[PDB]
Design a protein around this ligand. Structure first.
Ligand SMILES: OC[C@H]1O[C@@H](O[C@@H]2[C@H](O)[C@@H](O)[C@H](O[C@@H]3[C@H](O)[C@@H](O)[C@H](O)O[C@@H]3CO)O[C@@H]2CO)[C@H](O)[C@@H](O)[C@H]1O
Ligand SMILES: [Ca+2]
Length: 145
């Protein structure tokens, strides 16, 4: 249960060391109100904009060789396109795609059986929304299997 991602729940109230790329103004760390918008703790990433938007959240990690799994938790407006990607670990990029389906309909994208041979991994989440779309991202984990 040791989690290899830093600030995996945004509980500092800030992004660091997660990088935000793309339409940054679409994405914030917020103190969830109601708290149910977060999956753990008090804070979550919330995205929203009044026009269409795309962004990515990423973090790179140095890790012991081993087999790992990565995932997180999300919910939001019906039809927002979210992808989880892992790269730089030794193999080709792996991904999984999910769409949100409404408020508090939690999704748990996950990638398992990731054989880290480079001593590194990069975790990227991509979000693509239409005008007015929104959602929450929280509670990342990178575990050794
Ligand atoms: O079931 C409806 C849900 O709406 C959510 O609200 C969405 C976003 O999560 C929220 O960020 C956004 O709010 C805008 C902006 O970010 C905020 O600072 C400002 O005060 O209001 C803006 C909207 O006018 O609103 C969208 C919905 O439009 C709630 O997060 C969720 O709890 C739930 O009510
Ligand atoms: Ca949290």
């Amino acid at each position: 249960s040791r989690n290899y991602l830093k600030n995996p729940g945004f509980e500092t109230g800030e992004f660091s060391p997660w990088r935000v790329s793309g339409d940054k103004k679409a994405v914030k760390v917020v103190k969830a109100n109601p708290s149910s918008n977060a999956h753990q703790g008090e804070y979550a990433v919330n995205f929203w904009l009044d026009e269409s938007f795309s962004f990515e959240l990423s973090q790179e990690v140095e890790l012991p060789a081993g087999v790992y799994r990565v995932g997180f938790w999300t919910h939001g407006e019906k039809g927002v396109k979210i992808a989880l990607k892992v790269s730089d670990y030794g193999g080709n990029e792996r991904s999984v795609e999910v769409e949100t389906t409404g408020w508090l309909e939690w999704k748990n994208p996950e990638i398992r059986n990731i054989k880290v041979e480079t001593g590194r991994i990069k975790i990227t989440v991509s979000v693509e929304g239409r005008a007015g779309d929104w959602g929450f991202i929280d509670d990342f984990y990178l575990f050794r299997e």
